[PDB]
Amino acid sequence: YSYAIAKNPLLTTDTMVICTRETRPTSVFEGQKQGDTVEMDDDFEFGLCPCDAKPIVRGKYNTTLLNGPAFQMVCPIGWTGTVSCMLANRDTLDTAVVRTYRRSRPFPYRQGCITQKVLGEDLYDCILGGNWTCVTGDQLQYSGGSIESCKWCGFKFQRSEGLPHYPIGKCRLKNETGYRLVDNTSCNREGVAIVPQGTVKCKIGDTTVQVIALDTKLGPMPCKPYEIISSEKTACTFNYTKTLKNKYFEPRDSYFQQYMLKGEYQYWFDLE
């Protein structure tokens, strides 16, 4: 007997006959090509492969949701690629393309798709895709709107008081749960760094802030005192003499290492 399954001195044995994509030992239907290359329109989101072929997606990223011969584009924002419908030959193992869904230019913004994703506490933009097909992406920047809180140097702030400016660092809007980048201002303020794990506690507005010194220079602290401790058990005893305005005698207060002067009197303290 003869197999009699051929495409055109010494065949496919198929993919077409158990479909009319292509026409079908010396002594041995037509090919309907219409709709071989389908160009995906700006609003294209659903395609069905002919001859019950499997859709093979060769694109920029994964947006496709496939079921048998049918497939659907889910929020394909900026997606470029091809969706080739294929059928295999059992005896040779080679595959034949019945239809090619092509997208040569990136898809524009699809209406109803969310292009923002929250990763931890930071709100990121979706460079590619949307919804569950979103691909992150550089952190979203603050353009405007009502701010709930601002996280700077690892501390949360809700007021301009005690801060160099406002808003600072990463700030969360009342609209979103995620934080948006506002500034990259340094925590090292006049040789003092605002660090989450520090040496001394101090207050900025209403927030308890931890600080570490970089230099031992006589400089200001970027915060207000955290807690003030009154001696009432440490005692205070001192000696004083009469002097001239800003004129001092040789001894420097042993504990303070500075000439203690007020108006016309010099002081020397002793602390228990």
Add this chain to the structure above:
Amino acid sequence: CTRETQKQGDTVEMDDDFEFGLCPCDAKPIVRGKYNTTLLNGPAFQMVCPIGWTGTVSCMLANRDTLDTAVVRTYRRSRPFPYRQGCITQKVLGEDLYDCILGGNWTCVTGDQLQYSGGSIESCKWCGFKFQRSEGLPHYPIGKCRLKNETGYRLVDNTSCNREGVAIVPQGTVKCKIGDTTVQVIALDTKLGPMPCKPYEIISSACTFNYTKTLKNKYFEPRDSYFQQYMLKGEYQYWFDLE
């Protein structure tokens, strides 16, 4: 006198030790010199301590009514007289001992204040205060110092009382001590400068204060209201209250 039987005058050159002279014919001695050293009585005159003295002592003979005067003798000293033995060339004016550029004894012509060359010093008066020892002073001897063998003070140096912006004045604002001496001082400027003395009297003291934790030489904005400076020690900032 040999004027009546030579009317022409005589010439006498004063020697280095010449002190006494007598005018002939009872003539009056007219002294034309550098300064007053002469002690005259009728025709006789005395050169009291002439040290550096140059001039002439002309014996002028006068008649009346005609005021015509003829010189019978001229005592002359062209070169200055050297030091006369027995004459004192130092005069005390107040407390300061001055040198005699010309003359000696009561004929002394004051010169610049005698300077200290050497010898045992009794005391040193500087800025109106007496000092007998080097402690608390910039150097010693200072200003004008009196020797043991003398009564007057000799100039040692010309160091100022006003330093560094503080005046050591006999009548001052605040009392302070230099060695063992009680010194009065006045301020010239209100600059943050040192006092040239030690405290006169130390008075011992209630005292109450507040403190917080801070970083090494790192301060919070409020300066202690009284002291007007950031009270810092190690890792703690202070704020005092004195009631």
